[PDB]
Structures are given as C-alpha cells and as structure tokens.
Amino acid sequence: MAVTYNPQTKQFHLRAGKASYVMQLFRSGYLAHIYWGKAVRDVRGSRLDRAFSPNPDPSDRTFSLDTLPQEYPAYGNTDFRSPAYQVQLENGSTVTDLRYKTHRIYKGKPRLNGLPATYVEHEQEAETLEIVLGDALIGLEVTLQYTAYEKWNVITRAARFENKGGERLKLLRALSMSVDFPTADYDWIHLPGAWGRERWIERRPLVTGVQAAESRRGASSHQQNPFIALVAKNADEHQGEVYGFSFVYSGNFLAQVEVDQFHTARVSMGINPFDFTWLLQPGESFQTPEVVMVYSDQGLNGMSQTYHELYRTRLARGAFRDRERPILINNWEATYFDFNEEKLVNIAKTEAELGIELFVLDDGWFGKRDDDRRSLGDWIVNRRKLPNGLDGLAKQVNELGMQFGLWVEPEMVSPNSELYRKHPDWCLHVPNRPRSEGRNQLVLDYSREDVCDYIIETISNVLASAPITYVKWDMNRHMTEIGSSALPPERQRETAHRYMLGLYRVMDEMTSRFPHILFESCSGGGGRFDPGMLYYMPQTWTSDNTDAVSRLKIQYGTSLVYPISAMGAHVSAVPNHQVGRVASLKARGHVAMSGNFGYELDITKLTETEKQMIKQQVAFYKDVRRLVQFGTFYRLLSPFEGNEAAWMFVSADRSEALVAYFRVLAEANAPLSYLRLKGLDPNQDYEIEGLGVYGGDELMYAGVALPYRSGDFISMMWRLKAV
C-alpha cells in the first residue's frame, strides 16, 4: 500500500504486502525499472554503454534505451527490444519519445473506464501512483497507473493514452505493462490447453529470444490462458521466488518474455497487438486493461493463495461474492433437447430429495432451438415446450425447495433466426466475404450499441419473467472475419476490442439488473476463464471435460490463478464422453468436490445405491463447502509431474482441513506412498476421520502413510479437525 517518491533519489518505492517494486527517474526524464522482489527498506538505483546500442543523447554516450531497464519502452529511438507500445503518426513515422512530466500519489484504487479491474472497499486497502509521460512534439500523453495493495503482495498496472495534440495518432500496440528484469535466470510457466483440456501447467527454461502465449480468437481462449509467471530455477509449490502476471481481460492477449543479448528478461502483457489498432483523434483517450502482478518467495502456493484471496474478495463482485455457492444439477443429458414441462417437476422432486439445491434448465427452451443449429438470437420462450412459460416451471421447482436456473448464449445468432433475417448486418463480418460458422452460428457485433441494447432488452425480458436465481452465460465459438459495418475503415481493427467492451457493458448491466441471480460464465467450458470475466460473473464452468482423471490436470492448473470458489466441477455419468473412461462414483465425487460442486447427469438413470451415494456426497459437500470454497488451498502433488495429484483446504484459523489424494495406474506390489501436508499448526493435534489422531507437525514433516491400495484410479478424501 505504502507508495512513496523520494525527490532526492527520484525513486518511486511501491510497498505491496511483503514485496517492494521500485522505479527511478533517469537523466532527461526516462523512467527506469529498478527492483521487484521481497520488501526492502531501500535499494539504490552499470555498463549501459554497449557496442551497437546507440545513444539517444549525442551529448551523453553513457547509455542507450537498448540497455536501460524500463517500465514502458518504445522502439525506434535506440531501444531494439520488444516495445510496450507503438504509435504511427500521420507522416507515417512510428517514432515516439515519451518522457516523464509529473506524477501523483493517492489512496485507494481507481476504476478503469469501460473495464473490469481489481478494486478496494476502503481507501486504506491500497495506494495508487500515476506517472504522467509525454511526447511534447506530438502531444501524446501516457499515464502509467500503478496500485500497491496493503495486505497482499500485489502490484497492478495499466496505461492510459491521450492525444493532446492536433493530429491523428494510431496506436499499433498498447500493452498494459512491461518490466525489465536484470537477469533471465528463471523458468517461465504458462497455461496452454485446448477444449476439454484447459490450463495444463507448462514450465520451460527461457530462451535468448522471445517466448509467448497469446490468443487471436477474440476470447482469452482454451488454447492459452492469459497468465504467465517467471519462477526461480529451484522454486516449487512450497518455496522459492515466483512472479505472476495475470491479465484482467477476456479478449485477445499477448503475454511475452523477451530475453536480450545481455540476458535481461523483458516481460510484457496486454491486448494482442496482432490485428489490432486504435485510432485516437485529438482529445481522445485509450485505457488498457490491467495486469495483476504477484510476488512470492513461498513458491507457487504462495502466489496462488494471493491471487485466490485478491480475486475472490476484490475482483469478483455482487451478492454472492462471499457466499457459499449452490450445489446444482444441470438437466441437459436427461433430455439433450427432448423436453416438456411434465418430466421436469418430478425430476426436481427426486433431485430435491437428494439434497441438491439448484435446478438448471439447459439449451433449447427458446424459439426453434433444437440442435446446435437454430434460433440463437431469438430469446423468447418457445411456448410449445413450456406453455406455462418459465414462471410455472420455476415456481413449482421453488415449492420443491430448489432454486431455478437457466442457460443463455446471447453473443450468438443463427443464420436461420428472425434476428438474422431482420438485421443481417448485426453480425461480425467484413464486406463481400463468406461468413464462416462455428457450430452453425455467427457472432453478434457487440461493438454496436444497437446490438447491445437489443440483447440487454431481450435477455432482461426473459430473466424478469420468472423467479430465476442462476444463469449460465455460454459462448460457443471464436471470432472470424472480424469487422463491423458500423465502424469506418480506419477503425476496423478496433472491432475485437470494442466487441469486448460491448460485452462488458452488457454483462455489467445484466448483473446489476438482476442482483438475485448468481451468474456463471461459460465458453465451451473454460474458454474464457480469466479475471476479466470473474469481475462480472463470480464463477465459471471450468471445462466441458468432466472425466475424473482429466479434471485432475485441469483443476490443478486452473487453481494456479483462480479461486476454488469460481471453479465449477461437476459429477457426470460414465462412459465418459470426451475421453472414454470409467472411474467410481466415489472418485468423480472426490475430484468434483474439490471445486465448486455440482452435477451433470440424468437422474432418471440412477440406481438406488447410486442416488444413495449422491445423497451422501451432497451431505458431505455441504459439510465442507465453506472450507473448499473459502479456505486456503494448497497444492501438494502435481499430476504434471507424475501419476499422483494431491491438494488440501485449510480453514482460516487452521482448526479444520480437507485433504484429497489421487493416483492413476497404481502398479501391483507397489512401494508404500506418503503424503506430507501443509498449512497446519504444528503444535496442534488433529483428528483425521478414519485414521486417528496426528500432530500437525507429524502430518507436515513426516506425512501420512497412505492406506496401501492398487488399481486404475485411487481416490481418497479426509476431513481433519483440531482435537
């Protein structure tokens, strides 16, 4: 929180939790990066003169922008490294020369225009530094925005551009931050994946050159999550230096590390410059989304725990932010599309009898929507299928003791829909080109006000028509032929970002209009599982893959950044679907109860003993839900490192914990296995259900001797309680 500027040293010192982030003004208004790491009281701000690194000041051959470590570097006036931003002028030049002009420090944390951002509830929680840079010749101002939190090791960064000149300025690249580390002796971690296998942890040594994760899909994507980290060579889950970079944005991104000839590592992150430009007319401004930067010297768990608390309590919003989330059941595979009102209610009684709390109605309740082909965009209740509308169904579900929820997919329109026939120009498209389809549908142009107003109107008409208290908001394709008939040629490349701004406006309006609704975002599973979406909808469908073994990796990687409260995990029926696997009902429960728990099956196909297990799972999860959704989460064993996965949840006072252990392909006649715990009070004794009493110190330093077992999938869960 404690942000200072020392006029003698011209140094900015941002103290965030137990971390320091230090910058310093250098020569004629350059802004240098000095340090970011464990908190220091002070740090004083060599060899900037290097062969083939040229001199911006002919009178001063002591430095180059090619060697000075910076906060917001440009290319073209002596730095040859990857720039944080680039601007093209009317004369075609791309040379810009920002210098420090002034700064201000204030308590609290500002909102970002049109954008999600971490926030504070009290000014005392953080302090913000704004450093105003300017290129006087062209009238370009860039304000670097920094916030340091008191309680957490969190620095947040963004940049705001403003054209204070009399000419057009075209932003070709506008990243949210850039930081030059003094060495490149780190591994990097990022989170690549695909549909059905999101956010695998990938750790790699750095190369001398560039390495990056990005999305060009108009959505943050299944393929790369907008998160990267630099980690010390020897750092692991429990110890060591880790620097995380998390982009609070749900569209295209670039997350990059470039290592230069002097083995310094430039980390940068922001809206993907690929296929992007932004035109600033005189007087216009551009605000980047923010990047949330976390430091820990307590390994990956230390970093994750920071993100979890920050994101759960100061990014997610609304009535359910700090509330236990309902155990839900999705009633899709009960019917695919095949539905009408008579079934649904008895089904709801069966589900209610098992203790399930929320009944969700899936796709095909609307219009002529009856495969992945039709009526998207026409959001009126198909009053054949539900003649009594949503109201009659919902109210009965409520009188059964369950909440009622609904699926929507408002960003899509079917070529065969009334909306498309009335307004074909309302989809993203480019002149004279075929309109490529994903799952037989097109993308609505949310860069347009009329489109957004129409969606707000139409979805509100549905949501206010029944006592709905949960909505799953799905988006099931990525953008092609990106353009808008409502933008001029010179702004066409703003389409993807304006689309996201439009979606953000729409979601902000929808969640405000319906404060009693828990919204869960979805994009073919976890295709937009990012901090930007979390600001609008406090939980997310983690993956369409609900296979127990597959979920071990998906949940483990997702937890690197995202709080368990946001991480949807459901028990589904087997034969599994994406993969093909058979694991016990017990086992799938064990994996799913390690997330935000729910069900995704046909209850009409269950044996009494199965429903009986489900009744027990539900009762069990209710007992540990506060611990799972709000406790401190520790990863113990990594499925990316072998055949085991293990993790645990610990209460704030360390008096209670829940431990989960998994092993795949356990061999015959195998060595005994052990599990060392973390996060307990070493001087406290704990009762482990079914295993007796152990010292916290015994559990952490010697570990639990795991009951010997062998088989295709071992799954164990234990509750711990201080004696």
Added chain:
Amino acid sequence: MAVTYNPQTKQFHLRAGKASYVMQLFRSGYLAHIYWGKAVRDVRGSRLDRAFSPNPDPSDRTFSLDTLPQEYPAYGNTDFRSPAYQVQLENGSTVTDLRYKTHRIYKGKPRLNGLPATYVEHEQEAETLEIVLGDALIGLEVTLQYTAYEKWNVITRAARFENKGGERLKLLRALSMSVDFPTADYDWIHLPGAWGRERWIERRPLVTGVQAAESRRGASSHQQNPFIALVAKNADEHQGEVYGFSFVYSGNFLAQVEVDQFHTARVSMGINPFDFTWLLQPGESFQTPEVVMVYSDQGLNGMSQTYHELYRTRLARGAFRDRERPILINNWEATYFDFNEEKLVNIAKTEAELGIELFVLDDGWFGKRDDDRRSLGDWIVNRRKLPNGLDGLAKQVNELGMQFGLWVEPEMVSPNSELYRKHPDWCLHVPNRPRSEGRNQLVLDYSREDVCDYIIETISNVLASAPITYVKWDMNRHMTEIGSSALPPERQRETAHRYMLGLYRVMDEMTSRFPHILFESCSGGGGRFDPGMLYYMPQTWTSDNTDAVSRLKIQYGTSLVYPISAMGAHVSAVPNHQVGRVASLKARGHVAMSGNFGYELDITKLTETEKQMIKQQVAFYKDVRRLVQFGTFYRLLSPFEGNEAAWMFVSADRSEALVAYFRVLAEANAPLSYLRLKGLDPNQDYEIEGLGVYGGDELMYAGVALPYRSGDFISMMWRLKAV
C-alpha cells in the same frame, strides 16, 4: 569368430560378428584390456604413472595395477579398484599375483563343467581363446576363457580356477569377467523390479564410485535381473553404441560398474561374492558361469536382436528350440484347488472347440496339497481327486485334440509332508536356528546328491505315468538360513552355488529323460527369468501379473535380453488381481499375443461373444505365431518414456510384419499420433490390414497416421504383407 594372437605386438584380437575385442600382454606377463567396439583391422595398445598409484615393479615406475586396464584384476598388489577375484591363503594373506603363462586358440566353443552355456552346432560358428594365468608361488592357475562368434557381435567370457599347489586356497570372490573401459561417458541400464512387476528398464548416469545390481536370494530374482548395459549418452532403441552384459546363471549374482578417479569404468559380473566362498583343496578346480557380452552401434534394438537370435538358437535346446509353441490354457482359476476328473474333460472339449492346443493341470493334484500349505515334496498323484490317475485324464484330453501338461514345484518341501518327517535334514538349514518359511514351505537342499536323486526318481515316476508333453516347473520362495548338514564348516558358504549346480544337474536329467516334454520354468512368475534357466527350459512364465497395462512394461523390459519365444504371456480374466484394472478382451489379447501366447482363466464363466473373441484370437495368433515367436523384434515406443508402447515383428525376408500399438490415458481432443516402423524394405510396398497400401519407406520415414482414438486404454494390432 576369427581369433588371433600377434607375437610381435603380443596382442589378442577377437573378431566377433562386426565387433572387435582386443587385449595385449604388458611388461612381465600382465594382461591388459585394449579395446571393445566396432570391428577394426588393427588397434595399437599413457600416464599409467599416477600419484598414490604404487608400483608393483620397483625397477619400473612407469605403471601401477591401479591404472593399467585389465581383464582379470586382483586387489592387494597395487590395484585399489574392485577386483575380479580374491583368494585367501592358509597364512591369512589375500595377496595373489597372476601372470600370463600361455594360451591356446581353437575352433568351436567348449562346454562348461556343471553349467549352462551358449554353444555351437558347428566348429565354424565360433573360435575360443584360453589364456592361462598363474601365481607360481601358490600354485594358483586361472584360465580366462573367451569365445568369439562368427555371425553375431558376441564375446563370451568365463574363468576357471585350479589349485596346482600343495596348500588350501579359499576363493572369496570369483567373478566371470571384468573389463576396464577407457572412459565412463556412458549411461548404464539395468532391470530392477519386484514380484508382479519384473524387469523395468532403468537408465541412469554413472557415478564416480560403484553402482550395482545384485541378488542375494539364491535365485537370479524378480528384484534385479542379471543383465546390465553401458550405453552411449545419446544412444536409443535405433542407433548408438551399446554394450550388454548377460550372466548365464540362475543363482546369486553381482553386476557392477565401478568408475575410478581417472573416470575409467570397470564393469564386472559373476556369482555374488556376498556370503560366498569356495574352497579349493590341492588338485581341485572351480569353473565360473559365463557372461555373454554383446556390442551394437545400432542402439538397443541391435543389441536385443543379437541376444534373441543367440539365446533362441544357441542357448535354448531340445526338441522345441525352433518349434512354434502351443497356445495353452491353465486350468487353475477354474477351480483354485477345488477339483476332480468329471469337470476337466468337458472343459477340455470347450477349450478344444476354441482351438486351444494345450490343456494344463495346475497345483494340488498331488498328496494332501490343498492350499499353499501342504504336501510339497510328496509327488504322488492324490488318487482320490484323480482315481484314474493322470493317465485317464491325459488320454481323454488327447482324444479331444489337446496336449496335456502339468505343474510341479520340486525344490520345495512342506514341514507337513512325509518327506520332511522322514528326512528333516534334507532342507537348507543351519544348526540350531529357526527354519524361516516362505508360503509355508522350506527349500530342499539341492546341494545334496541324495536329495537330487530322490527328486529325479520321484518326478520321473509321475512324468512317465501319462502322455504328458508340457511341464511347468515352479519355485515359489527364496533361500533363508543357507546351509547344508552334508557340507563341513569350511564349505558352508558354497551351499547356495552347490544348490544351483544341483538344480542344474536335476533339470538336465529331467529334460533329457523326457524329450517329448516342453518345459517352462517359473518362479512366482519371472523370478528366475535368466539365460541359465533358458538352457534347460526353452520358455519362461514372464510374470504373475497379467494386467494388460502392467505387462507393457514387463514385456518391454524382458525383451531387452530375452527372445519372445521364451516370453510367456497369457490373457486372464478381469477384475485384474495384482493391480485392479479393466481392459478389453481385445486389449489383453493384443498385449499377450505379443509374447508366447496362452490363457489363464475359467472358461466356464465366459459369454458366447467372449469365447467367440477367444476363438478369433486363437485363430489370429496361429496365423502370426511364427512371426511373433521367431521374427525379428523391434521396440518402437517405450512405456518407460511416456504413455505409449509400441513394437513390431518382421519376417526374415522382410515380406511380412506384425505391428502393435498401445496408449494409456489418452486425453480428450488430443493431438494426432503417428508411428514410424523399422526393419522393412524401403523399396517394397506393404498392405496393412484395414489401412491400405504403403511404401516401406513411407512407413519408416513418415510413419503411420494412427486412427484417432481416446480412452483409458488404446490397443491396436496390424498385419503387414508385401504386395
């Protein structure tokens, strides 16, 4: 084959296949190791003078035995490295000083007294060098025996000790060979395991110090197979230098690499010196078992293919050496012990109808043997259970079209047996100590002639009583309290080796007495799967673990040394037993049909569709059996390196092949996979059943695009035939 001695250079050059092995006489009769690698026409035989490496000849300070690379080094007169042998004299000294005396070269390959050994069928196949060493002071002679094969890159080595003096000599250590490599820039491979998981491949860098695999179990063991290899850092299955060391012995062994201060690698192998001594009275001799040394520069497949051909055709013996082996079914789990004659015959008709060729009768046919507790040693047919004896049962099985086989366990005796009550001193034991049991049984003292004669008599009485044409010879525990009441104190530590010599004599007699019997050795699965046993029984039960996934590793590692003809692999019923796994009947067939194929289940529990699959598996294996059991085997993908396993068999003329592919835990929405083949004619075109026609070159250089699939266990097999 071509073994020469050059009197000018005093160099021995052994040319084996496409390899050279070169030694040279040095100074006053020392024998130096010069080279072992790819064949050279000649190789000429520095810095032997080193600080703290002392001089055996005071008049010659140019060398030390601590630095000279040797063939059969001793400790005590200047070499401080691990010795190949050690002898204690009556005066308590352990210093011995062997020097070269003479040598002889002859065509062919000798038999080894009391021992198995690779052999030749014609003198032209190999040549043998015997180098006679002697310590005149004590009258110790050691003859180093070397054989070089013409056709294969194979050098075999053993040593023969003889006391030509007038005092007692006690051998404390008598390894079969030792070789000093000039560098230690290799990895080593060995084959550790356990019951139910034999012969996992373990590859490790060398340490400066000693690393070794050994057995102290009186049996070669499940825990370490008597095989180690040195491999070039970059060597793999298909290319690179590999040196294999395979011990033709079934008892205790040591296989060791010691790297010294000058980073030379001494590889040695032989009877484990631990708990071993051998007393040589004047005039007595001791022959070590042999070690079979293979070189390849074509990677691990090149080495394995050499061992496979050598061991299948010039180690294994008897009528079935070159014969396709019967598809058998073991009728244990049909009954555990619960049996009598009425069932067995109808069972045999069902099995015969499916095309199965050999009916095997398991444990509990004898005496009072009805759990793992009783009557071992009493080998008379329990004529309650089989009133018509083995003859009536066997003859009916034969008239049904199947051969008849039997299980025996002749090395064990039950405390509750008549043998034990008549001769309790006939077990291995030490005076006044408790007799530890393994599976409620004791080990018979095969170091004793009376014991061995009794076993030969008793087992022969059974085997000649019926038209038996297959015997499984099992041994289900390891030795404790090793001793013999028939040896004096000074020879007690010879018990383990004399036991093995006794077993060898017994097995040699039994297989000669019953030339129409295919004998398969077994020791709780592959607990004595070694070249020593192969010389007596041409196939082996690979592992008690018949789980398909588990067998991928077991079979892959076993194939590193042992021919597929010897590698028993059976389809069993699921729930699997050691592990707990469910894989398709198709899948288990695929893994088992990649070995010497058979069945191990209860046919009375099979569905018609299952028997129908079995009928098809049997027909399929009959079609590819010659290719599997006698074709050239290539490992393609390693289950020790990831989730895939793949291998193939190619006919001698390369016109036919069988390819098998496996993958465990195939993820949803996975990358496409490919398989590149080996061993085909690149200019030939091949039809792959179910995939069309491909060039041999296409198959090997571009590979097969595998049909995309996902699931817990993927299993595929294809027949290839030249168009």
